[PDB]
């Protein structure tokens, strides 16, 4: 009965040279029972990407909530929300539920369309912003991801190299966690093109 | 909250706001209800000062409250939507608690109760709407046709009309409708309904709407061509 | 004229016309008489009927074993005020194990009627009450007016032609006050008092209504054949 | 407590015991566990005494208000659902009720609804409710047929309560019998287990476990 | 839900032929600490009632204020406030009894045991008990806390039933009360030597005695007691 | 933690005759092992020939009696001084008791009087409002001692006609007010012997068409 | 009390009309004309700005045409401030529907709800009605392209072509004359502008006094695109049809 | 607990 | 304008007095109380011949022992009946007994003056409440929107009330049978009604201790109408 | 309440739901239908806490039916499932949550495709080719992983479903008294009477 480790799952985000990557596994289970191998944890609102690990009902609820808010934002502002702004919106929304929180570990990723700067950020369940140059990790195999990212990561990786690093970080972390895996998705994000790749991994 | 007593008695014993709500009904487009031996038919006028209309999407005059009951009206259109919504909610609520769909009388009694409540509640004005509620009770083949009005009174009718020039079409129905022998078939009932509207309408083109309701949730709306055939048939028999 | 639209408005001479119009409703009401001695207090009320087929409107209401009133004016308002008295008498008994003083009863009615004369939306009570009772300081008689004014008296009368009975009691004051330990004689004085307010009609068996409370007498009402003795 | 009611060819039989207990203390042997809602509706009571007694007499008032408003006797389905929707509002508050709403109407025919305090509402032909329900089931099921006569059905319902009254410590006192037909319910008497047991033992030749 | 902090121990009382006596020590304990020594736990209401309170002192001070306010409220629009419409012991008790029960019913009790002693307008003795639970009872002798266990037995030897009340004088009654207070001082660990005593008589009225002391105490025999069994020295 | 309930002990007993009914109850009031009062009445005349007792937690008992007495008073006001029948009183009390279903009056209530045919009536309630009319009921601390004795002596349970081979039961019959009071007094003396919370005094309230009479008897004070 | 100063906004006239709704319609009749025309392959929204000043910033301005979501837009006629209150409500309602059902709101549902709000102000609350008439132009997968109008009464109706605001009588006659069912968007664009050009109270119709928008399926394969015209784009379309 |  | 709960200079509530004018416009309703029962009869008054007269419900059951007829703005009576039915059933639940006819009437009349600036105006309908209880026997009450109720031996309300009441004054005596009362209601209704009285445009009902409150069938009333005409022609 | 299964095949969705209703040591009923029709082409099965299940199912049914009348239009299975999920998502953070797990089987008439949604009491929605709630999954999922093909017919689906029920009847501890099977396709909802 630990909300953050019922369904399982992981998200990881990295920065590269004029690019960002965000990746997630596909598993959704009920403790030991694997239920779905198509459950994607990464969403996007315009050019801003949001990965969410934790309790699956909240993952879905927050996606729907941030779609709701970014749509109204766009109508009033007459422009797409930026990663720095969206990060503050996520933080606000989570802390609004301070004493009845969504059991989630969100991760923002994207490139600011004005400045062109790669941006990533992480949060705890009550909205504390964790900004990082290098990488953000989240989920049931966060320890494993921290270990993989800290050793494998190096700054200013090209999109094609960054893909290999983030993918290997996710896969080997997922293989040491019982509640993560069952497939994976990696988004490579450049200034005005985004590539989405499904990884081949062990299905146990 | 806004508390003002808008509906109040006058020296002569009248509630003018309720009576002025009837004037709004009198302004509204004509609506007619005729019940046959095994069916009820709801006819409705549509004014022809509005061309360039989109009849696909324009709110229909006759509304389904449940799969077995329908509601037409005359008066303020915006007001009618509120009553219809409340009626539809009550219809589902009745199925949920009683495990049986509403009777036509019960649904009418509810809608009439809502209309009455607005004649002695503070801050609100009466509904500028009179309704014709028609249908068949669950597991029953006897046709039902009821009328309500802003004051909240309701009653059952063999045939009835409301709206503008309704006194003319009521005059027609009073001599043409036989209590001892109502329209035996669907065709006879529809024809009498169309005939009655043709006393008032103008042209029988896209001015008349007809909706037929039959037992066991069998409701269907007639198209232009289907209605036009009745109009064509009636005019040829008239020239005699 | 322009200052009688509601109770919240003063007239240029400093009058409250809605309160005065409420007072007028009492004058139209049927006559009722109150009087007391040192041992007992008596209410006598002329009941009114719609016609010969109707019943006679009940004028007297019991509030506790030791207290009650007679009404003149809007009967539903008397029901509201008498119900309030019943609750206050009852509160005193349950909380303090104490019979409510007739004087406090009056103060409570005064303050309840007053609130309706100073606020927008409401209206003054349209009824006059005569409260009798027997408490720790002996027999009492109060006159309540919907303006809020409550007055303790030896005797009084309110309603239509109440001046006739009120003049009589003013003359008889020295006599009836000393009718101690004699209920029937005190009632007789009250019945003779209310008779001074009669015109064309006389006191019949289903017309007269009498109530009494005293030292060893709980508040009890007499109607029908029980008042035939006093005609 | 032990209560049953079953449906058969000739309508509905309803049978209950009359014991009330406070732990191991036998508080009463003469409790009415069948409520007479109207000439066509019955309700059985098991669980908390007050909860059953209070809410089923309340149910009767709601059924009366229905027929005043609708000029028509309430259906067994509608009546049971008023009760089931009521107890559902109190779910988790600790109400303890195991009831059966039994009756006849034109549209439904003979109908039995099981309604309990955790919100379960079930239509069915046979139900036994209470601490001695399993004992009643054992006898009732093994002897039940749809084609039972009114005489045999009444006896089986009585015999099933007796079986439970015997084995279940918290059931006993006396048996109350009802028969529900198209014309309404018919009371078939109070039967004390004190005399009924020996009468049944002798005539039937059953209860050989007991010292005769 | 409360827990009592600063507490007052036993209140003892009894009826006699012409009135009632009530007494209570002047201690305000803070658990095992004998913290406050000048605490008056007998509170007169008018000239015909004395309310004795044990238990939580903060709640006692609240009750004082209520009684003080009750006298003020009774005087309003009351020409007979010092005569026929003066506060009776029965009025004061019933008020408190109502409050105590209302408070327990809201799960927020006034953590006290109260004895209302007084004389009614007709000369009848009034003595009734009420506590944090709203439980009420009356008796010829009433006592709270340790008083219930040690005083009542002694006081009941004087007035064992209703018929003994006319036979009991104020001298005999006061002597028993004072004797009971001494026994409580011997045996109640949360008691003090200093106490107050009040007599409400139907003839002589309210007599309030302050700063009384337990005296004529037997301690001499203690010198002979040596060891806890065998020890001779 | 504050416990809002307490046990004030004592026991009560109601018996119904043909044209009368009695409601008896001991006058002892206790807490734990201490006596609070040797004479504290808990059987009350509530008017309209209804006598009532609510035994158990005395505070809740007094509150309930007080509320019912008040209910009788308002029944007169609202319904033209109509006499409250014993059956109507019983139903009214159920609603009082069940009104506090989720914070109960910890009392066994018994009322007694005459029904609308002039016959003796006793009604008994559990703490939360379930009620039943009976010829016989004991309530309170010594109910478990007294009740089976009543089953045997009032309702003649387990008693068969001599020489009938245990086939014919002893026939039921109404008891006289004299015979009932004997059973009450013997019930209470027996309960006093074997129950520590029962004793001091016995107060019986007898209800006939003429009114409500009282009788008092001493009980052992140990 | 305060009764003395109550206008009683929600009452009937002896003739059975709602005073405040009728007067609100009178207000709206002085507002800049707005026209909606529905074609088989799209919808046109055209609106005339209210007597423009030369120093008004035209490009970064929004007076008549507002976006409710990706698939639905509205043309306003009446009090702009009132309209914006209703537009934000409508925008929220569309997002509530999307959040609940994971599907874009059907046009009529949005129109009904917004019309139901207006109705409320005429029947209760004692407040003045919204002095606003809308033309709703939108698309969904059930009915395709749809035009509606709502007014202060809270009554809404569907249209093939419709005008609101000033000179609707003259404008509706001209639309009724030249409109036909097999019309294309580009033809409807021309009709909209021609109608405004004749019904306008101004001397000549120019780009700076107009707002324009289209809702086509002109995007790539089975998807709808909203085009709120820029000042230069209106200037070009005005020349292309031969008005200036 | 109660009385069943 | 002016306040809803305002007094006139004569000492009457304007709104209560105006509601009484609305009741005079209402259809006639007549009630007669006897020792064998209470009879209630009403004029249906269909506004048009197409209206199905059997759907006109102006006589109504409150409980098995209490009935009710109405006159005036009949839509206003629905919540009054709803309250009366609830009061009657609620009292049975609390006290395991039938509720007194007077107590029921008093409960209904308490709603009457609960209006002001609670509901926005008084009721525009008068009620004849007829019933039976063990204490005061067969009773007939007239409940007005003023909050006042009088008990009556006989009473007529509606448009032909003053004429019918004068007729009831002469005709009523304390030894009337139920059958005599039934005919008397029909007789007086036929006199004051505009259209000719028959079983379709007039309805009868009664309440007896034995059978309780019953609305008569059109077949039963038709025979009483025929019996009435024959008896008037017989002298 | 215990066993509810769902299998989406080529042209239909098949829902199987146990018939047993057990309270204590007594099977009170053996013919219980643990499903409600939300709309002509949408069916919802349910399982969980007693009382909550039916109360929730009927509340949803009423809401969907209300929508159907208002718009004269049938909501898509995707739309209905989203509505149901949101209700459960609200419910889980209520004072007393609905402890109900559901399967929603529907046929989308616009897409001409069958759709199966699995939603637990927390508001956790997933679209699946086959689904189950409770302990059933622990046997059926592995079995279906092996034997399921996406292009199966309705008849092949029923045989696949028989294989699940047999395995459950063999290895499950409790007697669930067989299942009621219902098929949802282009022609609406119908029940298989002999299973
Ligand atoms: Mg793994
Ligand atoms: Mg594995
Ligand atoms: Mg002892
Ligand atoms: Mg799940």
Task: Give structural notes.
The structure is cut from a larger assembly and holds ten protein chains of ten kinds. Chain C has five helices and ten strands; from the N terminus they run αββββααββββααββ. With 231 residues, chain C is of the alpha+beta class. Chain C has a single domain, classed as Glutamine Phosphoribosylpyrophosphate, subunit 1, domain 1, CATH 3.60.20. Chain C starts with 16 loop residues before the first helix and ends in a 9-residue tail after the last strand. With 222 residues, chain F is of the alpha+beta class. Chain F has one domain: 4-Layer Sandwich (Glutamine Phosphoribosylpyrophosphate, subunit 1, domain 1). In chain F, strand 8 and strand 9 form a beta hairpin. The radius of gyration of chain F is 18 Å and the shape is globular. With 235 residues, chain I is an alpha+beta fold. Chain I has one domain: Aminohydrolase, N-terminal nucleophile (Ntn) domain (Glutamine Phosphoribosylpyrophosphate, subunit 1, domain 1), CATH 3.60.20. Chain I has six helices and ten strands; from the N terminus they run αββββααββββααββα. Chain I is globular. At the B-G interface, helix 1 and helix 2 of B face helix 3, strand 6, strand 7 and helix 4 of G. The structure holds magnesium ion (4 copies).
Short recap of the structure:
This is part of a larger assembly, with ten protein chains of ten kinds. Chain I is an alpha+beta fold and 235 residues long. Chain I is built from six helices and ten strands.
Tell me the CATH architecture of chain J: 4-Layer Sandwich
Structural shape of chain J: globular
* CATH fold annotation of chain D: Glutamine Phosphoribosylpyrophosphate, subunit 1, domain 1
Distance between the termini of chain J: 19 Å
Distance between the termini of chain D: 26 Å
CATH architecture of chain D: 4-Layer Sandwich
- Bound ligands, each once: magnesium ion
What name is given to the CATH topology of chain J? Glutamine Phosphoribosylpyrophosphate, subunit 1, domain 1
Superfamily (CATH H level) name of chain J: Aminohydrolase, N-terminal nucleophile (Ntn) domain
Could you tell me which chain pair has the largest interface and how many residues each side has?
A: B-G, 36 and 44 residues
Helix content of chain J: 25-40%
- Radius of gyration of chain D, taken over Cα atoms and rounded to an integer in Å: 17 Å
Q: Work out the count of structural domains of chain D.
A: 1
Task: Provide the spatial order of strands within the biggest beta sheet of chain D.
Answer: 10-1-2-11-12
For the biggest sheet of chain J, the summary is: 5 strands, antiparallel
Discrete helix count of chain J: 4
Say what oligomer this is.
Answer: part of a larger assembly
Run of helices and strands of chain J: EEEEEEHHEEEEHHEE
* Tally of DSSP helical segments of chain D: 5
Report strand % of chain J.
25-35%
InterPro entries (chain B): Ntn_hydrolases_N (IPR029055), Proteasome_alpha (IPR050115), Proteasome_alpha-type (IPR023332), Proteasome_asu_N (IPR000426), Proteasome_bsu_CS (IPR016050), Proteasome_sua/b (IPR001353)
Keywords (chain B): Cytoplasm, Nucleus, Phosphoprotein, Proteasome
Subcellular location (chain B): Cytoplasm; Nucleus
Family (chain B): Belongs to the peptidase T1A family.
């Amino acid at each position: 009965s630990d909300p953050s480790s019922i369904n399982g799952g992981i998200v990881v985000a990295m920065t590269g040279k004029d690019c960002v990557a965000i990746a997630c596994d596909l598993r959704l289970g009920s403790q030991s029972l694997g239920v779905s191998n198509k459950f994607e944890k990464i969403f996007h609102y315009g050019h801003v990407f949001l990965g969410i690990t934790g309790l699956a009902t909240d993952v879905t609820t927050l996606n729907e909530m941030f779609r709701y808010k970014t749509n109204l934002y766009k109508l009033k502002e007459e422009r797409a929300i930026e990663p720095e702004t969206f990060t503050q919106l996520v933080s606000s929304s989570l802390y609004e539920r301070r004493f009845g929180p969504y059991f989630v570990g969100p991760v923002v990723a994207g490139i600011n369309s004005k400045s062109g700067k790669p941006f990533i950020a992480g949060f705890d369940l009550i909205g504390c912003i964790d900004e990082a140059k290098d990488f953000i990790v989240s989920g049931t195999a966060s320890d494993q991801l921290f270990g993989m990212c800290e050793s494998l990561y190096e700054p200013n990786l090209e999109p094609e190299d960054l893909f290999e690093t983030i993918s290997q970080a996710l896969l080997n972390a997922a293989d040491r966690d019982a509640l993560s895996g069952w497939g994976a998705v990696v988004y490579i994000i450049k200034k005005d093109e985004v590539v989405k790749r499904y990884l081949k991994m062990r299905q146990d | 909250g806004y508390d003002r007593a808008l509906s109040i008695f006058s020296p002569d014993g009248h509630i003018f706001q309720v009576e002025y709500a009837l004037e709004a009904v009198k302004r509204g487009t004509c609506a007619v209800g005729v019940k046959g031996k095994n069916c009820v038919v709801l006819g409705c006028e549509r004014r022809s000062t509005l061309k360039l209309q989109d009849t696909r999407i324009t709110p229909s005059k006759v509304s389904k409250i449940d799969s077995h009951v329908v509601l037409s009206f005359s008066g303020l259109n915006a007001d009618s939507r509120i009553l219809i919504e409340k009626a539809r909610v009550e219809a589902q609520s009745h199925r949920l608690t009683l495990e049986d769909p509403v009777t036509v009388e019960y649904l009418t009694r509810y809608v009439a109760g809502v209309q009455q409540r607005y004649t002695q509640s503070g801050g609100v004005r009466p509904f500028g709407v009179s309704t014709l509620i028609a249908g068949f009770d669950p597991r029953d083949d006897e046709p039902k046709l009821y009328q309500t009005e802003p004051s909240g009174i309701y009653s059952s009718w063999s045939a009835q009309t409301i709206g503008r020039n309704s006194k003319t079409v009521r005059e027609f129905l009073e001599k043409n409708y036989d209590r001892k022998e109502p329209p035996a078939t669907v065709e006879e009932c529809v024809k009498l309904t169309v005939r009655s509207l043709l006393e008032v309408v103008q042209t029988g083109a896209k001015n008349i709407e007809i909706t037929v309701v039959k037992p066991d949730s069998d409701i269907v709306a007639l198209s232009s061509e289907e209605i036009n055939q009745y109009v064509t048939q009636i005019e040829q028999e008239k020239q005699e | 004229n322009n200052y009688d639209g509601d109770t919240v408005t003063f007239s240029p001479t400093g009058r409250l016309f809605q309160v005065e119009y409420a007072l007028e409703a009492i004058k139209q009401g049927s006559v009722t008489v109150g009087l007391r001695s040192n041992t007992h207090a008596v209410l006598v009320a002329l009941k009114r009927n719609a016609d010969e087929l109707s019943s006679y409107q009940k004028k007297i209401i019991k509030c506790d074993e030791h207290m009650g009133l007679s009404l003149a004016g809007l009967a539903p308002d008397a029901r509201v005020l008498s119900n309030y008295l019943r609750q206050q008498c009852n509160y005193s008994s349950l909380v303090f194990n104490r019979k409510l003083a007739v004087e406090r009863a009056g103060h409570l009615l005064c303050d309840k009627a007053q609130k309706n004369t100073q606020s927008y939306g409401g209206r003054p009570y349209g009824v006059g009450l005569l409260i009798i009772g027997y408490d720790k300081s002996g027999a009492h008689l109060l006159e309540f007016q919907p303006s809020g004014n409550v007055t303790e008296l030896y005797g009084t009368a309110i309603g239509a032609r109440s001046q006739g009975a009120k003049t009589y009691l003013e003359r008889t004051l020295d006599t009836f006050i000393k009718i101690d330990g004699n209920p029937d004689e005190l009632i007789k004085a009250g019945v003779e008092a209310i008779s001074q307010s009669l015109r064309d009609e006389s006191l019949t068996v289903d017309n007269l209504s009498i109530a009494i409370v005293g030292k060893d007498t709980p508040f009890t009402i007499y109607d029908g054949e029980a008042v035939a003795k006093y005609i | 407590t032990t209560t049953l009611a079953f449906r058969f060819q000739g309508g509905i039989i309803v049978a209950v015991d009359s014991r009330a207990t406070a732990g191991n203390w036998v508080a009463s042997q003469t409790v009415k566990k069948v409520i007479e809602i109207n000439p066509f509706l019955l309700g059985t009571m098991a669980g908390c005494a007050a909860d059953c007694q209070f809410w089923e007499t309340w149910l009767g008032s709601q059924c009366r208000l229905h027929e005043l408003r609708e000029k028509e006797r309430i259906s067994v389905a509608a009546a049971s659902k008023i009760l089931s929707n009521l107890v559902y509002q109190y779910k988790g508050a600790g109400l303890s009720m195991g009831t059966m709403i039994c009756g006849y109407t034109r549209k439904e025919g003979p109908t039995i609804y099981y309604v309990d305090s955790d919100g379960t509402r079930l239509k069915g032909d046979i139900f036994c409710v209470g601490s001695g329900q399993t004992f009643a089931y054992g006898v009732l099921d093994s002897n039940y047929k749809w084609d039972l006569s009114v005489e045999d059905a009444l006896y089986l319902g009585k015999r099933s309560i007796l079986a439970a009254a015997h084995r279940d410590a918290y059931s006993g006192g006396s048996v109350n019998l009802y028969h529900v037909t198209e014309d309404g319910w018919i009371y078939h008497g109070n039967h004390d287990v004190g005399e009924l047991f020996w009468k049944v033992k002798e005539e039937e030749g059953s209860f050989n476990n007991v010292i005769g | 839900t409360q827990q009592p902090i600063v507490t007052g121990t036993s209140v003892i009382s009894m009826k006699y032929d012409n009135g009632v006596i009530i007494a209570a020590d002047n201690l305000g304990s803070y658990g095992s600490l004998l913290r406050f020594n000048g605490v008056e736990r007998l509170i007169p209401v008018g000239d015909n009632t004395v309310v004795g309170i044990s238990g939580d002192i903060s709640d006692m001070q609240h009750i004082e204020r209520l009684l003080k306010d009750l006298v003020t409220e009774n005087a309003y629009d009351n020409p007979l406030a010092d005569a026929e419409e003066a506060l009776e012991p029965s009025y004061i008790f019933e008020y408190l009894a109502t409050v105590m029960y209302q408070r327990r019913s809201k799960m927020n009790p006034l953590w006290n045991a109260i004895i209302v002693a007084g004389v009614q307008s007709n000369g009848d003795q009034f003595l009734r008990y009420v506590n944090l639970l709203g439980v009420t009872y009356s008796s010829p002798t009433l006592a709270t806390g340790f008083g219930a266990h040690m005083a009542n037995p002694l006081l009941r030897k004087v007035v064992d039933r209703e018929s003994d009340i006319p036979k009991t004088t104020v001298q005999v009654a006061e002597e028993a009360i004072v004797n009971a207070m001494r026994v409580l001082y011997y045996r109640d660990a949360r008691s003090s030597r200093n106490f107050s005593l009040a007599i409400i008589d139907k003839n002589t009225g309210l007599t309030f005695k302050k700063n009384l002391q337990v005296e004529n105490m037997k301690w001499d025999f203690a010198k002979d007691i040596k060891g806890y069994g065998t020890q001779k020295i | 933690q504050f416990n809002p309930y307490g046990d004030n002990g004592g026991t009560i007993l109601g018996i119904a005759g043909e044209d009368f009914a009695v409601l008896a109850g001991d006058t002892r009031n206790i807490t734990d092992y201490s006596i609070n009062s040797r004479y504290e009445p808990k059987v009350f005349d509530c008017g309209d020939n209804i006598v009532m007792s609510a035994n158990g937690f005395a505070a809740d008992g007094d509150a309930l009696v007080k509320r019912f007495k008040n209910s009788v008073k308002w029944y007169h006001f609202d319904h033209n001084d109509k006499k409250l029948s014993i059956n109507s009183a019983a139903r009214n009390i159920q609603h009082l008791l069940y009104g506090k279903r989720f914070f109960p009056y910890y009392v066994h209530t018994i009322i007694a009087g005459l029904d609308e045919d002039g016959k003796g009536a006793v009604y008994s309630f559990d703490p939360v409002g379930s009620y039943e009319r009976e010829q016989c009921r004991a309530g309170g601390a010594a109910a478990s001692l007294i009740m089976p004795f009543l089953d045997n002596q009032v309702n003649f349970k387990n008693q068969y006609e001599p020489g009938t081979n245990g086939k014919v039961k002893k026939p039921l019959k109404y008891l006289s007010v004299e015979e009932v009071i004997k059973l009450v007094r013997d019930s209470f003396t027996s309960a006093t012997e074997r129950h520590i919370q029962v004793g001091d005094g016995l107060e019986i309230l007898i209800v006939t068409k003429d009114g409500v009479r009282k009788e008092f008897y001493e009980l052992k004070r140990d | 009390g305060s009764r003395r100063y109550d206008s009683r906004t929600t009452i009937f006239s002896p003739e059975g009309r709602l005073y405040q709704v009728e007067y609100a319609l009178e207000s709206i009749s002085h507002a800049g004309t707005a026209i909606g025309i529905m074609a088989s392959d799209g919808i046109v929204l055209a609106a005339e700005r209210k007597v423009t000043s030369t120093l008004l910033e035209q490009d970064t301005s929004t007076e008549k045409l507002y976006k409710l979501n990706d698939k639905i837009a509205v043309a306003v006629a009446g009090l702009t401030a009132d309209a914006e209150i209703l537009i934000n409500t409508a925008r929220i309602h569309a997002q509530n529907y999307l959040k609940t059902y994971n599907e874009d709101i059907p046009v009529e549902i949005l129109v009904r709800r917004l019309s139901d709000i207006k109705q409320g102000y005429t029947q209760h609350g004692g407040l003045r009605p919204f002095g606003v008439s809308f033309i709703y132009a939108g698309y969904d997968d059930r009915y395709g392209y749809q035009l509606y109008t709502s007014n202060p009464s809270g009554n809404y109706t569907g249209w093939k072509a419709i005008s609101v605001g000033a000179n609707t009588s003259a404008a509706q006659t001209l639309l009724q004359m030249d409109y036909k069912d097999d019309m294309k968007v580009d033809d409807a664009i021309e009709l909209a502008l021609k109608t405004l050009s004749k019904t306008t109270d101004s001397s000549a119709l120019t780009y700076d006094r107009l707002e324009f928008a289209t809702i086509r399926k002109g995007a790539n394969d089975g998807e709808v695109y909203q085009k709120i015209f820029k000042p230069q784009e209106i200037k070009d379309i005005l020349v292309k049809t031969g008005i200036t | 607990x109660a009385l069943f | 304008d002016r306040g809803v709960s305002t007094f006139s200079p004569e000492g009457r509530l304007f709104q209560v007095e105006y509601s009484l004018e609305a009741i005079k416009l209402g259809s006639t309703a007549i009630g007669i109380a006897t020792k064998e029962g209470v009879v209630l009869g009403v004029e249906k008054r269909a506004t048009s011949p197409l209206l199905e007269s059997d759907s006109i419900e102006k006589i109504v059951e409150i409980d098995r022992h209490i009935g009710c007829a109405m006159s005036g703005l009949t839509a206003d009576a629905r919540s009054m009946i709803e309250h009366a039915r609830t009061a009657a059933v609620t009292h049975n639940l609390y006290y395991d007994e039938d509720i007194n006819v007077e107590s029921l009437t008093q409960s209904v009349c308490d709603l009457a003056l609960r209006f002001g600036e609670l509901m926005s105006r008084p009721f525009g309908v008068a009620l004849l409440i007829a019933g039976h209880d063990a204490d005061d026997g067969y009773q007939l009450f007239h409940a007005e929107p003023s909050g006042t109720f009088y008990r009556y031996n006989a009473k007529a309300i509606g448009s032909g009330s003053e004429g019918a009441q004068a007729e009831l004054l002469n005709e009523w005596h304390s030894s009337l049978t139920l059958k005599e009362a039934e005919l008397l209601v029909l007789k007086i209704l036929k006199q004051v009604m505009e259209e000719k009285l028959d079983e379709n445009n007039a309805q009868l009902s009664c309440i007896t201790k034995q059978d309780g409150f019953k609305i008569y069938d059109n077949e039963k009333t038709a025979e009483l109408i025929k019996e009435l005409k024959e008896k008037e022609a017989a002298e | 309440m215990d066993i509810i299964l769902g299998i989406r095949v080529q042209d239909s969705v098949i829902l199987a739901s146990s018939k047993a209703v057990t309270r204590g040591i007594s099977v009170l009923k053996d013919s219980d239908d643990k499903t409600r029709q939300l709309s002509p082409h949408t069916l919802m099965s349910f399982a969980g806490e007693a009382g909550d299940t039916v109360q929730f199912a009927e509340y949803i049914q009423a809401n969907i039916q209300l929508y159907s009348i208002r718009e004269d239009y049938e909501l898509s299975p995707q739309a209905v499932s989203s509505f149901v999920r949101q209700e459960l998502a609200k419910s889980i953070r209520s004072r007393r949550p609905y402890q109900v797990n559901v399967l929603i089987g529907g046929y989308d008439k616009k897409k001409n495709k069958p759709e199966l949604y699995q939603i637990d009491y927390l508001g956790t929605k997933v679209e699946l080719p086959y689904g189950a709630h409770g302990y059933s999954g622990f046997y059926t999922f592995s079995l279906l992983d092996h034997h399921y093909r996406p292009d199966m017919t309705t008849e092949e689906g029923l045989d696949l479903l028989k294989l699940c029920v047999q395995e459950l009847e063999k290895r499950m501890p409790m007697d669930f008294k067989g299942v009621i099977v219902k098929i949802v396709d282009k022609d609406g909802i119908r029940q298989v009477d002999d299973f």
